[PDB]
Predict the structure.
Amino acid sequence: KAFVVTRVGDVFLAFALFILYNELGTLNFREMVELAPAHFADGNNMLMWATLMLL
Amino acid sequence: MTITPQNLIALLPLLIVGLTVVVVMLSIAWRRNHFLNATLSVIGLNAALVSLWFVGQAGAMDVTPLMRVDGFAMLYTGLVLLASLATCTFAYPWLEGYNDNKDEFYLLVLIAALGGILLANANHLASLFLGIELISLPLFGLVGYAFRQKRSLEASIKYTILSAAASSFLLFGMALVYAQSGDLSFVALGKNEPLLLAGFGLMIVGLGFKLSLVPFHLWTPDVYQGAPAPVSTFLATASKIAIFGVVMRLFLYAPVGDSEAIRVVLAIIAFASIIFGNLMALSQTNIKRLLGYSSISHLGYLLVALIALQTGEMSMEAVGVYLAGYLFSSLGAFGVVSLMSSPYRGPDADSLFSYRGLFWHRPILAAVMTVMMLSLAGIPMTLGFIGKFYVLAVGVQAHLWWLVGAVVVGSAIGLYYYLRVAVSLYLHAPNWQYSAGGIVVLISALLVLVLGVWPQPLISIVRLAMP
Amino acid sequence: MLLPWLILIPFIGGFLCWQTERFGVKVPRWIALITMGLTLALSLQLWLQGGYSLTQSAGIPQWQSEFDMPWIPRFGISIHLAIDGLSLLMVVLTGLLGVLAVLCSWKEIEKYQGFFHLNLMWILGGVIGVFLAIDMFLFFFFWEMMLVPMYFLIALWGHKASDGKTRITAATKFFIYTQASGLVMLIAILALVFVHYNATGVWTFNYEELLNTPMSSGVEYLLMLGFFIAFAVKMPVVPLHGWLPDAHSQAPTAGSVDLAGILLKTAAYGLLRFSLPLFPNASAEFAPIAMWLGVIGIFYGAWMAFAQTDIKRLIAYTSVSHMGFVLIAIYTGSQLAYQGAVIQMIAHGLSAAGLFILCGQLYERIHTRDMRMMGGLWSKMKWLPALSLFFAVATLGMPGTGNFVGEFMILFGSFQVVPVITVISTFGLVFASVYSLAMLHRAYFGKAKSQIASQELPGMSLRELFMILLLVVLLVLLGFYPQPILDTSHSAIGNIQQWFVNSV
Amino acid sequence: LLKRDPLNSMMNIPAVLSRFAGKGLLLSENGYLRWYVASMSIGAVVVLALLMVL
């Protein structure tokens, strides 16, 4: 039951991982930190899906 | 026209075989010996194969208004001669155990070879009739050879009444066409009024009995169970091989066969022949009835090529190569069945349940039956696949989608019973001319394998023969 | 040059094993091992000597080595063997699986053993010939002649003619379900060639000129369905996969190694090579049906895997779940997705082969096939269940195994092209865990008193452990370090994708 | 509900229909020779009818 429940969370975790590569390209944390505001001049609505599902 | 030496060289196949009947009949009346009669008959048929080279020295020409000699007829005469050669070599081991009068067999097979090599050469509707009946009278009488059993006579009588009935339908159709047309010559015919078409349908009935088509196939099980296995070699291969040539030539030459009214009817017969063969063929546990069931489906594949003879010139060689492959497959399979009956044994006990084992009894002979039985189906490395491949190509070429689909689904249905017999020869077990009979079927096994893997040389022969 | 020889060694070895059957009985085992060693030598020589890191945009025709020979000149049918980069991965995989097949059959003497091995080399050589095939008829002939000798394997070696369940259901469904669709794709080949013959006026059966043949819309769609039907009965797709569990549960597990690890490869090879480039607009229209069938296959195979009580049918129903990822990968417009399918596909073979070898190994240890009958064998076996735990672990997406990087780059590319069908697809990993744990707990976790026969257990020999150790270490290096084979396949995958992109 | 596999069974119905239809065709054969000749007449009837509708 722990194994099933932790893999449900890991599916939820990998969902945000797909979205971050689709939106910001690089998955390194720091390069992500000063790449996130550069790519987000126009659209922001989909980042809540990334971050809520990351959460 | 009169007789010229060109006509005699053209007629040389019909002549050598006829001289053989006379010499065989004189030899029978002189000594009544099995060894001398077998030797004399096989020498004449081998002399007919040698003389095929000499008619190849002659070109495409006529002998009489009854016959036309082309290179197409050269190949069909060859198919019939090897089947006659095949049936005498399979009959000597079966007839050594026969009680008496063991010498009339070769005389009747020789008459049937005359009939076969007369339907190869055809140009007039009467030659069509002189050929059908010359071959039937030995097939009237040879399925009734060894009438001492309770089923050979049964088989002979069923085939006798039905074959006379088909000949009466063919003759009545043959005249109802000639009422419209001024001549019965194939070419001169058709020079779409209903009487000519109605006469044509009657000839289809009289021809589709012997070609084992869908509403006339009822004889093909019973006589194949009843007849001797040496007779079944000739009855499966030579008769229908010779008969298919004349029915193809009638539609090629006659302008009435160009019309779609006859084309639709023959296509439906071909459609139903494949289906009504390959569905009732599954349940059989008898090898002779099993081969008789497959014969109906093989003649159906020939028809789905013949319907598209008039669309594209590839149908000529397609029919020719499937006939060559079909000859070799059935001769090997029926030779193994006859080679299991090395004595007369009264009634031979052959069945699919009787063929458990047979690899630890006789391993070489089981391999021949398996190779030929896989060649009947459509498995590659066998000549049947190349023949199957051309009939699919012909149906694709002529946009006969229902017919080519029938071949595939008929192949899909018919794979099942061929494979059981192939594996049933691997379950747990329950004289000089005999070695010669083994050599004939083993020679055919080598040929079907090398012409399945390497099929070009047979195509070169076929395009050499086709005009 | 090397290609005629590399498809012929399997057939030459079958002739020689059966020749030396009269000389001896311990010969064909040792003959067969060396002959498959020569097969991998030529395959690995092409990997090393060839320019595997070649130009990514050198067109659709690109081949490290190429053979041409006239076979039937009337239709232009030629022996057009030609090896690409991804085709070379397929050849090296089947050479390795052939070594495993001939190693698992070691110490297996019978009434006849040369017959078994000539058939064994014949079927493995048939798969090699499909993998090297550019001419359509040569491709079809090889596709259909690797299919006949397995029937004799399931028939005469499924069990030695004692029970009739090893032929009339298992082997017969295996044979018919493949051959009817093989004839379907043959008439598909012929309809394509005839429309090309109307267009140009030459009877050709070659892939390069049939690649760009002009066809009107609404015509090539039917031919694409005709190709896909034969390519959907060989790899397990949703409507037609009933042959797979019966075939794997009855054949000997060496025949099952051939039936699972490498016969499942050739259909997705053909979807990448022969179906996608020939029919770009038909495949673009057919794409969403392929995605729906792919997601249905993953969920369906896992449920049927969870619900089953035996082991051979259990791993046989993992395979149908695995191939759904591959089908969705192929029917998308992404280069990364295709390169994920290749690594997932090689790992699929390597993760099914070890399990089947070990399931057959466990049966001959205990003489009992039902999984729920045993339980708690860990205190008895010393190396089987520990190695089996990692192979069940490698089945699902566990990193350090090749399956994780495989399935998961497909998902990256799949979400790149289309969101909603991918977000459904990812949940098969949770279902992959449940049938993986079901196998592990029902077989090995528990008490040995679940079965009376679980109280006297044999030992494990050295060579089986050697060939299990090689697969587990080989599969771990593919999971940790998959770069070398991705650099190999990049250009072949790239031109297929560029043609699928540019031709639409 | 998935203890037995549904789609394997529901695509076996071609074999079910073929075997049952094949059994019906075998039962259609009789062995009495009068109906064989009736088959010949009824083939002639349908061939002439199928030719006269063309």
Q: What stands out?
A: The radius of gyration of chain A is 13 Å. Chains A and D do not touch (no CB pair under 8 Å).
